[PDB]
Design a protein around this ligand. Structure first.
Ligand SMILES: CCCC[C@H](NCc1c(COP(=O)(O)O)cnc(C)c1O)C(=O)O
Ligand SMILES: CCCC[C@H](NCc1c(COP(=O)(O)O)cnc(C)c1O)C(=O)O
Ligand SMILES: CCCC[C@H](NCc1c(COP(=O)(O)O)cnc(C)c1O)C(=O)O
Ligand SMILES: CCCC[C@H](NCc1c(COP(=O)(O)O)cnc(C)c1O)C(=O)O
Lengths: 395, 395, 395, 395
């Protein structure tokens, strides 16, 4: 039983075994749309969910099934469901759970396209959402209504890597009859296990650390079998249609083999870079859970096995400085994703949020000098030199 | 301009050209999650939709863009949007268009998972749906309400390959202020062009004939640029997350190269097989638009350039006969998809709809002896011999 | 037994079946390097070739095995062996068969890199080669020696699509104790079957028509089991190492599904274009086996079921005209391969053979005005218009 | 310049950059056979090697070029050449260098299929080979002849992980006018750099650690540009045809991103497991360069940055014990490859070499109790427990 081995052993083996018919060690790429039955009877036995086996890849596929099983084991969940994207993991989940008249309490400090879905799309389906500062569990409690079905959080959260106390929030949600859904993208199961802290459902964008190689868009949902069966057979099948391609599942299986050693190196690197930035007189602030001045440092130590691979920081001199800095890096690459093997950097005030009113960005935690860094697998000395050179230039 | 060449030339070339940097003839597989910017300024220029280029594959990708452009040309539409599945093409479309309080008029004779989405999921978002017999355009008119945003049809329709008069229905929908959405999966653009008949939006499951090779789940939406931009930047980005993987897009580009020659052969084969079945004294009925006894035969001749690759038929002796028949084929393969290079066969009363009450199936057009056949690229004589042998055995 | 069905049925089905463990219809992509054994005993049973099954993909793989079996059926050969390239199919074959002191009789009119291998590499291994005009079977006989192990031919042959009488040459080779190896790349098994005419071994570059989609480099060898086992376990395993990747095998399996309908359309198109060129007063010569003035026309009719998709022709005005013409096409693409879905064109005197002495090219059949055309799946009217426009411009 | 960064930075970045036309961060998969030219002139400019760019994937491809460049940087070589297999890397190399009448001095302790090529195939091309114990550099010197073109070694070598002193052997080979070719498969460039020690040419099977994921068969050659150009344009193009598919190159690029962190973990694990085995009273011998009793331990410390991921050991009780042991593991997988993320185990006397005469195996270093272990990325405690359990059972 794969649930019995060590976590690195599970990373490598859980959900997978040699192909029964051939012995192939790699999980085969079942790049098929349909599946053949031996008889009328076998076709019937599968459709009524009266007998196990495959029918059609939108419903289930052996390659994707391996990925779902592996991630269920890694998050200590019953079952997994792969999706087309991180967005689809979130929306499949919430659209399965909620209907007209229901309510959601959401953290404000969440991924931007998640916020758009919650702010604009949900209310158009009759589903109301209240946003709160989830670093303050009391605001979550105060926002709960009789109609609240879900509490939704991300931790750590952009853009300043603030935290949410999963265990505390889970207790509050459950006392009030709601489910807790946690987006665990930033951490991966190697660094944080929300189900073990009382969350009901975990979602990821596997696009970030789980795949890790910057070449797959995808999501995963993990939770109880009863829920996952609804997310599969109603949410995905009927509502979003957000299935993962078998090739993408295979790539993610391949990427996740190195999850443990990648996370160790990302976090070792990031701690070094965060300490460098904290010592730098041109840098006003450094946001990183591994720094002891982080305002929720102790919580982070309890909840996270490592402080993560992402750092935010503020450069002296505001917008122009941030722009000059990101324009002066030679090694770090300018891009908006994270969790890849390459170090990526972005300056949201000049890049993504450049048309947004400067005062709105500030309300949103986005100061003019804020830079976000996804630390890769390069030598940290080279990343530090590159940052040092660019900071010197920018200031 | 690719919109100027013949249709076979467009099938091969539209949306594609040699790679500019290398000359590679095959469209490269851009199996990437993110895209790098040259500067802060270039990153900003893309996000505000102020300058063209790529950002992130959930938003857009060069491989997928080629597929979208090709299918837009083939359907004579402005723009295309690829999706994770045929379901996602439909739901992305309808969830973009509709909100709480809106209404849809839908054909009853539609794909089963579409019917589930319309029957069960839409009403839970406050979106009501009226089902009608779309072979009777008057029932569509009578079901229209002030709140009706969309009329939704499939033609030909399962299970008896009845038709819908696209042009007539489009006129009725537009007079009453609604959009017409047509699922053109069964035909492909090679055989039917709903936009040219007044439809506003076409959707496909590319899983069937467009890909054609039984190895891709995917969808596509084609329509006006203004609509497609909303389906991309709200529907997909925010709501369903149903993006297509670049690999799947490349496979579908590859599959669609042979669309014209495949459709010609599927339809040539199917006409021969349909005539054989019509002459067979053990077969009570044959449903095929190429047979002159089809009740909408003339409409079909006007609307469709070929009668298609799908045949339904009823075998003497009801359920037991249908089961014995599908259990007695040696060449045809028992499976529930269609539009693959292999001939596929299914007996819905014993396979898919075996737990459904026999009288409900009958209301739904599914008689106990009904067999559905997706005609492949084999020698038709071999398919005929296989059917002949199995029919003889079954009766 | 797949060897019993019609040829189109075999194209679709031979060598393939639904996956036994899952029912997946598409052959799974077994993208693996190794294979696991259940026990020491099972590992031993495979290595001594004492029991069937897989060990390691360089030796054999289930995806590649399907391709090998399919092509063996299509060529009416016992066994198949896939390779990294068409070159590797040829060299694996000849390096398996021949050793220091042996001799080969080869056609002169062969693929250029084949000629280089025969002219320069073989003699450096002590293997001598005599080149002859294989359109004259007597020259083959006259060149035979006691040490001659192989007679090697291509038909049709570049650059003027001359033919070789397979049956006649086979008889001559066998009387003198030699094997006949035929490169059947230009025809595919759909159009010519050298084994049925007495050849011992057929090779292809699957890069051309068998794959057909311009996205795979690969080869195949077909022949008797005893030979193929030597080509696999010595030639490939030890000598060239030229194994095919499972992904490439899967792509070629996918491409070959449409071989019959592609060849029909390539040849229908090519006959139309060849007739157009023959009627054009700016074109001095047209080389195409489907034209009745071809000097071996009747032989072609006996030996080939279709005249093929390749045309060569000579434009009035020599080198400058040929260059102006290829520079003036808008639809045809300038490239050196053939057998793709797109129409490709090349002018060897200005492109490939531009540094070669003009008189050497002439000895080699390459006149200054010679253009080679690989006819694709576009509308022939569009290809004709494009050629017409470019010829008018060039002259 | 990528040759200036740290080695981990080079692992991630060398040979790669964002796509120029699109910014895609992942190297695109250029899964193409041919490449289009803009004009006759551009086609000519490429063929004569008079201008840079692509022509045809057997000759060169942008995806494969990235892999070749990366591995050249990592081995501190001028140029790289990817191949279909490790075998093809070796044979392409040696068949390029050598012709009838030439001689090779080879280590005896080399990969088995290499030994077959050298023992049986080379002499049939007039190329003689002398095998020597390359742990004794004097035997290499004594075997040199006026005709010796190459000295060929592997280090560490199977089956007992003996070493060869690269620097010493290079000096001996060069004094006598020969090239030194080193198979660096077992180490990877992360652990050993033969070019930096005076080797002329390095080869790998990328099937093992460079790819690392058990899903690619492939090779690479690294050396001087003048040599590599001959290996490409004669060896590969003409002789072996052993090109690598672009997909396989992309997979290997992806796999090699984690080379540094994988090697660190493989070797950390292997040292722990080797120490465990050395302390075990049922284990008579343990072969591992990281153990101080290894007979060439100091050499290993100078030549290798880590002691590697492979261990051989001898179990008490000979053949029956070895068989019982490999039949009793539950976590380790029975297979013949190495360098994958999963721990693999084999007992050559019962598996591979079971039909070989027991006394021949002994001459070859293969004792009846010898087990070979490729240590994966699992928790070492789990691998140790699995070995402990199986050893206890076997004895
Ligand atoms: C387009 C902006 C880049 C996206 C990226 N975050 C994406 C992201 C998602 C959405 O996942 P998908 O992209 O697979 O749908 C979900 N959850 C988190 C925490 C995310 O960071 C970022 O850089 O924040
Ligand atoms: C699972 C049942 C097989 C599905 C198949 N019809 C699927 C299908 C879809 C849905 O497309 P996707 O599967 O890509 O989401 C949409 N539209 C039509 C007309 C369809 O036939 C059939 O055999 O009818
Ligand atoms: C590089 C020149 C293009 C090659 C192409 N002929 C390639 C080719 C080969 C070699 O096959 P591979 O390329 O798979 O090794 C073998 N046999 C024939 C008849 C060929 O035409 C041509 O256009 O003639
Ligand atoms: C089939 C036996 C398994 C092969 C494996 N060694 C394969 C191998 C090769 C050959 O490489 P390819 O397989 O990519 O052609 C070259 N060099 C070394 C050192 C090898 O170990 C082993 O387990 O030793």
């Amino acid at each position: 039983d794969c649930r019995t081995y060590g976590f690195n052993t599970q990373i490598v083996h859980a959900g997978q075994q040699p192909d029964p018919s051939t012995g192939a060690l790699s999980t085969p790429i079942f790049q098929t749309s349909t599946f053949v039955f031996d008889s009328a009877e076998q076709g019937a036995a599968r459709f009524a969910l009266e007998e196990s086996g495959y029918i059609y890849t939108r419903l289930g596929n052996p390659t994707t099934d391996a990925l779902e099983k592996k991630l269920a084991v890694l998050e200590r969940g019953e079952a997994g469901l792969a999706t087309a994207s991180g967005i689809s993991a979130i929306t499949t989940t919430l659209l399965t759970l909620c209907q007209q008249g229901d309510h959601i309490v959401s953290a404000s400090a969440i991924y931007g396209h998640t916020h758009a879905f919650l702010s604009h799309s949900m209310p158009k389906f009759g589903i109301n959402v209240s946003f709160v500062d989830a670093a303050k569990p009391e605001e979550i409690r105060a926002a709960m209504r009789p109609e609240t079905k879900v509490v939704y959080i991300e931790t750590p959260a952009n853009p300043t890597l603030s935290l949410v106390d999963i265990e505390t929030v889970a207790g509050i949600a459950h006392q009030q009859g709601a489910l807790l859904v946690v987006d665990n993208t930033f951490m991966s199961p190697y660094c944080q296990q929300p189900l073990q802290l009382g969350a009901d459902i975990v979602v990821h964008s596997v696009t970030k650390y789980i795949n890790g190689h910057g070449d797959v868009i995808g999501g995963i949902i993990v939770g109880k079998q009863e829920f996952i069966d609804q997310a599969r057979f109603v949410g995905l099948k009927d509502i979003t249609g957000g299935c993962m391609s078998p090739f993408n599942a295979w790539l993610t299986l391949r990427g996740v083999k190195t999850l443990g050693i990648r996370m160790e190196r990302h976090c070792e690197n990031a701690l070094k870079i965060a300490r460098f930035l904290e010592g730098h007189p041109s840098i006003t602030r450094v946001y990183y859970p591994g720094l002891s001045s982080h305002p929720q440092y102790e919580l982070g130590q309890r909840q996270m096995s490592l402080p993560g691979g992402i750092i935010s920081f503020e450069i002296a001199g505001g917008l122009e400085a941030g722009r000059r800095m990101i324009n002066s890096v030679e090694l770090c690459l300018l891009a908006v994703s994270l969790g890849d093997t390459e170090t990526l950097i972005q300056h949201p005030a000049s890049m993504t949020h450049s048309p947004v009113a400067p005062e709105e960005r500030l309300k949103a935690g986005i100061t003019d000098g804020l830079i976000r860094l996804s630390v890769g697998l390069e030598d940290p000395e080279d990343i530090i030199n590159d940052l040092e050179h660019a900071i010197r230039k920018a200031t």
